[PDB]
C-alpha cells in the first residue's frame, strides 16, 4: 500500500471539477482518520472522522488559519467502520468541497480559503491502511 501519513501534491492547487479519491481500510479499534487540504501551513479543509469522542462517532471539519482552528462543522452521519475498506471522494465545486463515502453523498464544506489554486497538498493520516490516493479532472 502507501506509508501513512501520506502527502499527495495537488499541482497548482485545486479547482472546480477536480476529484480526489482516497482508497483504504480502517484499522481495527481505529480512533481517527484525517484529510488535510493544505495551503502552506494553513489547512483549507480538515476532514476528521473521530471513532470515539465521548463514546460517539462524529466527523469534524474545520479550517486552520495562521495556526488557529476555526469553528467546527460536525456531522453525525458516520459511514466508516473499524476493519472495513472505504472510498472517500472529494469533488471540488465552486462554493464547496463535496464529500462522498462508498458512493453515498456525506457532506459539503463551504470554501473559507478563497485561493483554491494555492491548496497544493493533501495530507492523509490516522488509523488506516492506505491503498491509493489520486485525482482526476471530471
Ligand atoms: O477543529 C479541528 C481540530 O480539533 C482539535 S480538538 C484537534 O486536536 C485537531 O487535530 C483538529 O481535529
Ligand atoms: O478541548 C476540547 C476541544 O479541543 C479542540 C478541538 C475540539 O474538537 C475539542 O477536542
Ligand atoms: Mg474490526
Ligand atoms: Mg465515494
Ligand atoms: Mg485565501
How far apart CA 105 and CA 52 sit, in angstroms, is 23
Cell of 68: 488557529
Domain 6-136, CATH among 2.60.120.200, 3.60.10.10, 3.30.43.10, 3.40.630.30: 2.60.120.200
Q: Which atom of ligand 2 is nearest to the CA of 60?
A: 8
d(CA 19, CA 91): 4
75 known member of a binding site: yes
- The answer, yes or no, to whether the previous bond of 29 is cis (omega within 30 of 0) is no
Of the listed ligands, the closest to the CA of 54 is 2
Q: Whose CA is nearest to atom 4 of ligand 1?
A: 69
Query: Which residues, 6+ apart, have CB-to-CB distance to 100 below 8 Å?
Result: 88, 89, 91, 106
Which residue shows C-alpha cell 475498506?
85
Residue 46 near residue 63 (C-beta atoms within 8 A)? yes
**Burial of 2 from C-beta contacts in 10 A (0-12 / 13-18 / 19+):** middle
- Residues paired with 123 in a beta bridge: 7, 36
Buried-state track 26-42, b at ≥16 Cβ within 10 A, e below 16: bbeebeebbbbbbbeeb
Spell out the domain ranges in the chain: 6-136
The closest of 1, 34, 19, 14 to 114, measured between CA atoms, is 14
Torsion angle, alpha carbons of 135, 104, 26, 111, to 10: 50
| C-alpha cell of residue 8 | 499527495
Burial of 11 (0-12, 13-18, 19+ CB in 10 A): exposed
Amino acid at each position: 500500500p502507501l506509508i501513512v501519513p501520506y502527502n499527495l501534491p495537488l499541482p497548482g492547487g485545486v479547482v472546480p471539477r477536480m476529484l480526489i479519491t482516497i482508497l483504504g481500510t480502517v484499522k481495527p479499534n481505529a480512533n481517527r482518520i484525517a484529510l488535510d487540504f493544505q495551503r502552506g501551513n494553513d489547512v483549507a479543509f480538515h476532514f476528521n472522522p473521530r471513532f470515539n469522542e465521548n463514546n460517539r462517532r462524529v466527523i469534524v471539519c474545520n479550517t486552520k488559519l495562521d495556526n488557529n482552528w476555526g469553528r467546527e462543522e460536525r456531522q453525525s452521519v458516520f459511514p466508516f467502520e473499524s476493519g472495513k475498506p472505504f472510498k472517500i471522494q472529494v469533488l471540488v465545486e465552486p462554493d464547496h468541497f463535496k464529500v462522498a463515502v462508498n458512493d453515498a453523498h456525506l457532506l459539503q464544506y463551504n470554501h473559507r480559503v478563497k485561493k483554491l489554486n494555492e491548496i497544493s497538498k493533501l495530507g492523509i493520516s490516522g488509523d488506516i491502511d492506505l491503498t491509493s490516493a489520486s485525482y482526476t479532472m471530471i
